[PDB]
């Protein structure tokens, strides 16, 4: 499929950016996570980034570490994550769905088999957080064989060689990292680096989504204004889940309110 390509063309025509929330699949349980995801979509999410729980998530700060832990406490497995993904796709046929994976979960029972499972449930992209472009060959090859976009990271201090590689190897979107460090809402990044955005466009890279530390509508607007195609917010969303565990109605109301405001900021 061409779900990202279709989304970005629609957004370009409307002259707006994408807002893409991240959550951990199965946090705080399967049923509540499915409701959370439906609420994110209803409130205006253009695309989703969805984490599969992993025992040792090394690009993640405490907020998302604790989301992983809640999902495990609910007994969430990768198999159950694929069942969820199938159910999400069956309800929402056009929204791009990206997975945030750690390498061992992809490598585990065979890389090719992992990407084949992604294709069957209708996933659009996979970002493997601990596989740099230098180690990416078997991952990106399997992804393309199964019509999945392999997502690559453009860090703030990317040199020219890396920009060229990310532009050639990636598809769907390019992940524009706001800052060094791990995920977290309280650690706000730099203003999207114009030179990186401009070079990625010069090399015909997939459109850039800025992520890490984006927790406010002002940061979303700033990203689109700088020429990025949109922004991803994770920890800020997960904080609303964590805050409202005993109050599911209030959780969804606050999620809706935040997502709506973040989306409005993408308009931009």
């Amino acid at each position: 499929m061409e779900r990202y390509e279709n989304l970005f063309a629609q957004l370009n025509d409307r002259r707006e950016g994408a807002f893409v929330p991240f959550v951990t699949l199965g946090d705080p349980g399967i049923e509540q996570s499915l409701k959370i995801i439906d609420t994110l979509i209803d409130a205006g999410a253009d695309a989703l980034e969805l984490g599969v729980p992993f025992s040792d998530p090394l690009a993640d700060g405490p907020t998302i570490q604790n989301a992983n832990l809640r999902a495990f406490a609910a007994g969430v497995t990768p198999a159950q994550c694929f069942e969820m993904l199938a159910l999400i796709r069956e309800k929402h046929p056009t929204i791009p769905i990206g997975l945030l994976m750690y390498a061992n979960l992809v490598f585990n029972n065979g890389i090719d088999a992992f990407y084949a499972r992604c294709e069957q449930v209708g996933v659009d992209s996979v970002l493997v957080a601990d596989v740099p472009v230098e180690e990416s060959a078997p991952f990106r090859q399997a992804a393309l064989r199964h019509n999945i976009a392999p997502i690559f990271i453009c860090p703030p201090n990317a040199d020219d060689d890396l920009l060229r590689q990310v532009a050639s190897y990636g598809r769907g979107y390019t992940y524009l990292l706001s800052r060094s460090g791990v995920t977290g809402a309280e650690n706000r990044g730099a203003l999207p680096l114009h030179h990186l955005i401009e070079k990625l466009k010069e090399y015909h890279a997939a459109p850039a989504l800025q992520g890490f530390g984006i927790s406010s509508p002002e940061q979303v607007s700033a990203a689109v204004r700088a020429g990025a195609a949109g922004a991803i917010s994770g920890s800020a969303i997960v904080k609303i889940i964590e805050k409202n565990l005993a109050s599911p109605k209030q959780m969804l109301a606050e999620l809706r309110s935040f997502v709506s405001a973040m989306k409005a900021a993408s308009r931009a």
């Binding site: 025992s55 090394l58 390498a103 601990d130 472009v133 690559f152 990271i153 453009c154 060094s180 791990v182």
Partner: protein
């Protein structure tokens, strides 16, 4: 692209977030430059001799092998400043940190010997040191926590996960991914992403080079085997390296068997795990059927890690080195035996290597064999733990 090979056969690599690649490339370039720099080599050699106390003794045991055809020597890394082999390569890495203009050090530690080494080198060479250590290890290796703090290092207990080495490793890497502009990650073992397995080997290989010279001097021939415990692989690869091309010399690595392999409470991924990607490397690891990383277990904090360095996985794969396991109880017996019959209190990690050598002797007591055990550290850090065990089991 890299200057040196990041792989040992299938194992190794650089499986880190993209943000960290320039730091690893910078480290590799600095190492390659330093290895050709006579000034760097002279500075490192001076510290090893005049500050750390190298060469370390090679001690012939004369009571524990009585009545057998085993001759056993102990390579005395327990005599190194700090009390373990960890000090050798920390001195090299600290000099690399200074060469690269870094002013801060991050390290993980399990036994606290790498933490102690990192703290002492930082006090000497003027670096600001922060050390991550699992909360369980902070308790069971408490003497080393006190030593690190008296030397001015920040020690940060890690309560996440198993609250042991894996979890400290995780936190150290998370920290580095945000602080690499000013901080060097002084990884404490021959594992992790390239170039660490290579650098750590090259900065530990004096262990085997000295051993070879000393055994030639005393016996006029090479050992039949050299034996070392394997936590992440640094003391073992340090002993093995200079012997790899001496095809007659057996290389035996000893993983922790914990409560017994059959219990699943062990730290023996090389022989009982399966290949995975974690901690920046493709290596054998303890993992669930779904590919979650399992918690390891050992009585010894320095061995309590669910993976292993990639050069050991490679040496095993080609049959050049053999790997075995020793349980908590076998290690405790070897600890007691060395204390009482040789007057040397060994680290519990090193006790695993000794326990295997004692088994090689006891199983075949008329086999003529010349063995060297790498006595990687002293056991001062373990005396309160060992006391409490021997008391509870009523001795």
């Amino acid at each position: 692209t890299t200057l040196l090979n990041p792989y040992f056969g299938e194992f190794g690599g650089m499986y880190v977030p993209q943000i960290l690649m320039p730091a690893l490339n910078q480290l590799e370039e600095a190492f390659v430059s330093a290895q050709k720099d006579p000034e760097f080599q002279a500075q490192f050699a001076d510290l090893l001799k005049n500050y750390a106390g190298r060469p370390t003794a090679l001690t012939k045991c004369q009571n524990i092998t009585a009545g057998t055809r085993t001759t056993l020597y102990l390579k005395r890394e327990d005599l190194l400043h700090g009390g373990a082999h960890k000090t050798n390569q920390v001195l090299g890495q600290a000099l690399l940190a200074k060469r690269m203009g870094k002013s801060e050090i991050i390290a993980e530690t399990g036994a606290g010997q790498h933490g102690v080494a990192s703290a002492l080198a930082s006090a000497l060479l003027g670096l600001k040191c922060r050390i991550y250590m699992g909360a369980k290890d902070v308790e069971r290796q408490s003497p080393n926590v006190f030593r690190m703090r008296l030397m001015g290092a920040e020690v940060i207990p890690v309560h996440s996960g198993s609250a042991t080495l894996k979890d400290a490793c995780n936190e150290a890497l998370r920290d580095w991914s945000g602080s690499y502009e000013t901080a060097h990650y002084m990884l404490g073992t021959a594992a992790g992403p390239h170039p660490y397995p290579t650098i750590v080997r090259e900065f530990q290989r004096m262990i085997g080079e000295e051993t070879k010279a000393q055994i030639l001097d005393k016996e006029g021939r090479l050992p039949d085997a050299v034996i070392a415990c394997v936590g992440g692989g640094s003391n073992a690869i340090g002993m093995f390296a200079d012997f790899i091309n001496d095809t007659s010399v057996g290389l035996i690595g000893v993983e922790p068997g914990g409560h017994g392999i059959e219990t699943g409470e062990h730290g023996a991924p090389l022989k009982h795990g399966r290949v995975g990607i974690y901690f920046g490397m493709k290596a054998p690891m303890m993992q669930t059927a779904d590919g979650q990383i399992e918690e390891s277990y050992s009585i010894s904090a320095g061995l309590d890690f669910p993976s292993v360095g990639p050069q050991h996985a490679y040496l095993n794969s080609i049959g050049r080195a053999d790997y075995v396991s020793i349980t908590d109880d076998e290690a405790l017996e070897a600890f007691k035996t060395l204390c009482r019959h040789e007057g040397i209190i060994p680290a519990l990690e090193s006790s695993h290597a000794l326990a295997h050598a004692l088994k090689m002797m006891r199983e075949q007591p008329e086999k003529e064999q010349l063995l060297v055990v790498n006595l990687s550290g002293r056991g001062d850090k373990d005396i309160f733990t060992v006391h409490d065990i021997l008391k509870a089991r009523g001795e």
